[PDB]
Enzyme design. Structure first.
Site, PDB file in Angstrom:
ATOM      1  N   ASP A 141      -0.045  -7.492   2.172  1.00 28.83           N
ATOM      2  CA  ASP A 141       0.517  -6.137   2.251  1.00 28.83           C
ATOM      3  C   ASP A 141       2.044  -6.262   2.397  1.00 28.83           C
ATOM      4  O   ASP A 141       2.601  -6.152   3.497  1.00 28.83           O
ATOM      5  CB  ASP A 141      -0.133  -5.357   3.405  1.00 28.83           C
ATOM      6  CG  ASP A 141      -0.012  -3.853   3.323  1.00 28.83           C
ATOM      7  OD1 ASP A 141       0.369  -3.341   2.244  1.00 28.83           O
ATOM      8  OD2 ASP A 141      -0.360  -3.177   4.316  1.00 28.83           O
TER       9      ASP A 141
ATOM     10  N   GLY B 112       5.066  -0.159   6.435  1.00 23.62           N
ATOM     11  CA  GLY B 112       6.192  -0.725   5.708  1.00 23.62           C
ATOM     12  C   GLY B 112       7.413  -0.936   6.578  1.00 23.62           C
ATOM     13  O   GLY B 112       8.351  -1.635   6.183  1.00 23.62           O
TER      14      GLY B 112
ATOM     15  N   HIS C 246       0.784  -1.245   0.000  1.00 19.82           N
ATOM     16  CA  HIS C 246       0.000   0.000   0.000  1.00 19.82           C
ATOM     17  C   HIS C 246       0.820   1.303   0.000  1.00 19.82           C
ATOM     18  O   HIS C 246       0.336   2.335  -0.473  1.00 19.82           O
ATOM     19  CB  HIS C 246      -1.059  -0.012   1.112  1.00 19.82           C
ATOM     20  CG  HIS C 246      -0.523   0.351   2.445  1.00 19.82           C
ATOM     21  ND1 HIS C 246      -0.101  -0.614   3.334  1.00 19.82           N
ATOM     22  CD2 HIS C 246      -0.334   1.570   2.993  1.00 19.82           C
ATOM     23  CE1 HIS C 246       0.295   0.043   4.413  1.00 19.82           C
ATOM     24  NE2 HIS C 246       0.177   1.361   4.252  1.00 19.82           N
TER      25      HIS C 246
END
Ligand SMILES: O=C1c2c(c(C(F)(F)F)nn2-c2cccc(-c3n[nH]c(=O)[nH]3)c2)CCN1c1ccc(-c2ccccc2CN2CCCC2)cc1
Ligand code: NA
Ligand code: NA
Lengths: 234, 52
Positions: A88, A186, A42
């Site tokens: 993700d 992240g 994302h």
């Protein structure tokens, strides 16, 4: 990170910062090796063109051991969608290799079963990032870190108003108002085993930040070790 | 108890092969002669804080 402590010299060396064209940090990342950065899928939507900053701990002041790296290849997991937030995970291959020094070193990639039985079973992990210090606020200039308790699988599903897939995992506090936030995505979630730090999660999402009864959701790195290995071969 | 009993005395990875403990290491480390400890091959091995 909401709450927690600042990362002192050489405490979070595997931390990466995704920086947009305006030279501002929008997402985190983990150093796996000299050429590879592990991040959230994302995060790739949060900026058109981006670079990778390493050895940085204070954004406003240059650290001399700080380095900017361009991205050669972006290896995104095709199974990812904003509707589910599943898979993700992304891998970035850099144009130039990272120089390992104080504040710059990779986090270890554990083996699948050992990671599941010996890491995910430890009481806590450490999450870190340059994200928001409060749910409503701006990006942090200082790299912070927070020890987070591994949260019970069904208890995690219960706390969420969304579906917690087998590629996701909970860590955090039910009442204590300290957790990751926007901008920490992240970033690394490492588990220390015998003084060595292994990469276990990628900050994925949450319902606000440090909200009582809610937790931080991370990508379960163990679910992707073969895909990660294959990524580094390409 | 093998691997379940204190990681089978391995520094890092623990596996069971023919009802015994078998240790291994992450990339950048070599398994010691004792077949338990992990030795870094070079500076800055993975998962080490750079506190020195
Ligand atoms: O993840 C965040 C978020 C927000 C903010 C904020 F508040 F700052 F704006 N930060 N933030 C954030 C960012 C990073 C870390 C942490 C964190 N870690 N630990 C902790 O406590 N928080 C918090 C807003 C909500 N959001 C989010 C909520 C829900 C999903 C989701 C979940 C499942 C399925 C589909 C979807 C996607 N669907 C949902 C409906 C439409 C699309 C996605 C994003
Ligand atoms: Na800096
Ligand atoms: Na919480």
């Amino acid at each position: 990170i909401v709450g927690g402590q600042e990362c002192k010299d050489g405490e979070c060396p595997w931390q990466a910062l995704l920086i947009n064209e305006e030279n501002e940090g929008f997402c985190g990342g983990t150093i796996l090796s000299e050429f590879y950065i592990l991040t959230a899928a994302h995060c790739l939507y949060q900026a058109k063109r981006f670079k990778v900053r390493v050895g940085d701990r204070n954004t406003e002041q240059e650290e001399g051991g700080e380095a900017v790296h361009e991205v050669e290849v972006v290896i995104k997991h095709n199974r990812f969608t904003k509707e589910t937030y599943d898979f993700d995970i992304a891998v970035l291959r850099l144009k130039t290799p990272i120089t390992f020094r104080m504040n710059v070193a990779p986090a270890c990639l554990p083996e699948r079963d050992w990671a599941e039985s010996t890491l995910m079973t430890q009481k806590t992990g450490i999450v870190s990032g340059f994200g928001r210090t409060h749910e409503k606020g701006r990006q942090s200039t200082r790299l912070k870190m927070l020890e987070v308790p591994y949260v019970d699988r069904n208890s995690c599903k219960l706390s969420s108003s969304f579906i917690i897939t087998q590629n996701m995992f909970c860590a955090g506090y039910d009442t204590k108002q300290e957790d990751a936030c926007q901008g920490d995505s992240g970033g690394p979630h490492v588990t220390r085993f015998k003084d060595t730090y292994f990469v276990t999660g990628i900050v994925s999402w949450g319902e606000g930040c440090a909200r009582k009864g809610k937790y931080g959701i991370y990508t379960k790195v163990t679910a992707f070790l073969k895909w990660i290995d294959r990524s580094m071969k390409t | 108890k093998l691997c379940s009993l204190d990681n089978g005395d391995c520094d890092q990875f623990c596996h069971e092969e023919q009802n015994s403990v078998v240790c291994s290491c992450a990339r950048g480390y070599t398994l010691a002669d004792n077949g338990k400890a992990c030795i870094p091959t070079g500076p800055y091995p993975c998962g080490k804080q750079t506190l020195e």
